[PDB]
Amino acid sequence: QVPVGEALLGRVIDGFGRPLDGRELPDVCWKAMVRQPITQPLMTGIRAIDSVATCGEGQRVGIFSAPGVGKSTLLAMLCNAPDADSNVLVLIGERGREVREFIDFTLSEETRKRCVIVVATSDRPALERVRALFVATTIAEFFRDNGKRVVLLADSLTRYARAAREIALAAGETAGVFSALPRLLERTGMGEKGSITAFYTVLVENEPLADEVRSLLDGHIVLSRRLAERGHYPAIDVLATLSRVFPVVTSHEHRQLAAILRRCLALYQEVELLIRIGEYQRGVDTDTDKAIDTYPDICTFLRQSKDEVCGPELLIEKLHQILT
């Protein structure tokens, strides 16, 4: 059984649904191919995402990263999306210290009050790690039916998959969990009086699961080890990041700005080596010249403090100031 209710907000529970917060659980209830179309933006307040890869209310999105690139801080920022009512975070297969750090020092007090956090660490049984995602999805669905815009954050599908495989290896004693992964992903999305927008993390570089998850979702955000080592945070690789609902949830003004931005990064990347070895010559190529002049402002725009939440009005204004 899964505990559901508005009173779970601000609580931390496990794969079965037992409190981990040093207190007893409150009084709460126990519980296809396409969904409704995605038509409304869900602003994250993260400028790199909202500018060129705008998410949709009810979208499912994969976050692809290597270890130690600031994925946790990105997830904490996603918890502060101005367009969401509440959050369901599910943390599967990480070590105790890492998870403890995350909840106590990375998530603020204000953010935690708006989350239900479901935790199944690596030291827990494979069955618990797998059950954690079923529980989180059911809790998110209950909020959706109460007419909330829910954000579901799942870290990670990779460790979920590892736990599911462990269960398959023990299926002999004594055996729809084995086919569950695509059905869980399809349980999120738009609904009558509500929505679930979902971010699922995938570890690289494991490799086939990433391919399976790409075929199932509506966009991908790619984190880059290179950016992270430069101290460029969130370490989002813009040119490798895509949102399938981008053309439908944005304005024309927005789309034009985003195109200038991508063009600049693409032009810059092609000439990056020439610059690094000091062989670039101005006047040569005007477009690239403009890209290079524009590049430092774009980098500043993309790098974002974990405490800064940027709404859409300000977003558009900053893009104009640097690109136009």
Length of the chain in residues, anyone? 324
Of 109, 145, 132, which Cα lies nearest the Cα of 9?
109
Q: Alpha helix locations (H) across the chain?
A: 47-52, 71-78, 96-101, 109-112, 126-145, 157-169, 180-186, 207-216, 225-229, 246-249, 252-276, 286-302, 312-323
The domains of the chain are located at 1-250, 251-324
Q: Are 143 and 86 in contact (CB under 8 A)?
A: yes
Q: In the Cβ-directed half-sphere of 312, how many Cα atoms lie within 13 Å?
A: 16
Q: Are 129 and 15 in contact (CB under 8 A)?
A: yes
In 3-state terms, what secondary structure has residue 65?
Answer: strand
Of 64, 75, 61, 102, which Cα lies nearest the Cα of 203?
64
Which one is the CATH code of 251-324: 3.90.650.10, 1.20.1270.330, 3.40.50.1970, 3.40.1180.10?
A: 1.20.1270.330
Q: Cβ contacts of residue 148 below 8 Å, gap of 6+? A: 85, 86, 194, 195
Q: Cβ contacts of residue 228 below 8 Å, gap of 6+? A: 68, 69, 70, 235
Q: Are 8 and 116 in contact (CB under 8 A)?
A: yes
CA distance 246 to 185: 20
In the chain, breaks (C-N over 2.5 A) are found after 31, 175, 205
| Count of helix runs (H) and strand runs (E) in the chain | 13, 11
Residues annotated within a binding site: 68-73
Q: Determined by which method?
A: X-ray
Residues annotated within a binding site for ATP: 68-73
Of 61, 57, 53, 58, which Cα lies nearest the Cα of 217?
61
Strands 29-30 and 3-4, by their bridges, are antiparallel
Over its C-alpha atoms, the chain yields an Rg (Å, rounded) of 21
DSSP one-letter string for 199-214: EEEEE---HHHHHHHH
Q: What angle do helix axes 286-302 and 312-323 make, rounded to 10 degrees?
A: 150
Q: In the Cβ-directed half-sphere of 101, how many Cα atoms lie within 13 Å?
A: 7
Of 187, 233, 179, which Cα lies nearest the Cα of 65?
233
1-250: in CATH 3.30.70.1140 = no
Instruction: Record the resolution, in angstroms.
Output: 2.1
In our burial notation (b when 16+ CB lie closer than 10 A, e otherwise), range 88-106 reads bbbbbbbeeeebeebbeee
- Please report, as a single letter, which amino acid is at residue 207: E
